[PDB]
Amino acid sequence: FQGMLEYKKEDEQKLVKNLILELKPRGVAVNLIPGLPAYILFMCVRHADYLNDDQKVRSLLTSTINSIKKVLKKRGDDFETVSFWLSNTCRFLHCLKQYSGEEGFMKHNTSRQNEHCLTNFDLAEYRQVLSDLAIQIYQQLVRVLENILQPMIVSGMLEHETIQGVSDEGTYTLDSILRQLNSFHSVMCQHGMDPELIKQVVKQMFYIIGAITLNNLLLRKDMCSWSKGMQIRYNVSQLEEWLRDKNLMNSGAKETLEPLIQAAQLLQVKKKTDDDAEAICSMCNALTTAQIVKVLNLYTPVNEFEERVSVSFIRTIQMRLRDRKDSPQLLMDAKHIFPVTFPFNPSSLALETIQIPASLGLGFISRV
């Protein structure tokens, strides 16, 4: 066994239909070995490269790319399908680099894996196409995530009263959000998505939570109270706890919640004296002047026996914040997407040890 898969040029659309078009991501063999289709696809590429069949290599790589794209048009609003094909497209790309012959990618390969390198074809052109494709899939993944999380955020973070006494159905709570984050994370892990990629996905998700929660705070006077600040600050602590529980404190997800955290604290601190003003101006380094001033204006006292924030106090804040040339930003762009990176992630999987389960239906495939 050299780790190659042989097929006939007429069975190519069948090779592509079973491995990509209608391969269920919840399949047993695929969940046992992620990401199997990418490994199987590459071993086919190896044979065509070994056969020196330039026509076969072109047709395989083209059919592969066009098939993945077609899957994303039919099941593009399904998180599991998109996550699976993001993971496998990357693995395919990683395989194309790892066994390219270019020594810069085989620095973590066993000697056996180095025998699996391509010898006839330089596929650098196709690598860029796949890399561009992965970016498109990522953006679609994020879009799907945002669409799922969005109706949960306001309800779970703001409208539902969590802790108390410390002083189509919108029914979601904080726990609803934490379960949804759990589903997302576990699915990605099941699909063998790269650690560095999962981190960016998590960082993006936390941004959405932070942005949407902050925006509603800035839009809704009744959410700007001492109690609500206490609730928000508690909810965030549970989000941070989730990150530790998944070992994701290096994802930068926490830092995205900083504007929300500072706003919540702004809702709680004293708002009367000059010392209080100076404390606010030193605490809110992640909020703009427009945002700080807005929150101070929206702030609702607990009852009639607490005065509203005076305009003199607000003007005092504005005076002390002229030292910084500030962004005019008020509401945050909730649908903003951070640029994604796909660093090279070589595999340890020995290709010559892989079997083809009959549940896949690749009987025409002959191991070489």
DSSP state letters, 201-213:
HHHHHHHHHHHHH
Resolution of this structure in Å: 2.2
Q: Kindly report the number of other CB atoms within 10 A of residue 107's CB atom.
A: 9
189: Cα within 13 Å, side-chain hemisphere: 9
Q: What is the end-to-end Cα distance of the chain in Å, rounded?
A: 6
> Does residue 356 contact residue 365 with C-beta atoms inside 8 Å?
yes
C-beta separation of 200 from 340 below 8 A: yes
- Say if residue 35 is preceded by a cis peptide, omega within 30 of 0: yes
In three-state secondary structure terms, 367 is strand
DSSP 69-104: HHHHHHSTT-HHHHHHHHHHHHHHHHHHHHTSS-GG
Cα 20 to chain centroid distance, Å, stands at 22
Question: Do the beta carbons of residue 8 and residue 14 sit within 8 Å?
Answer: no
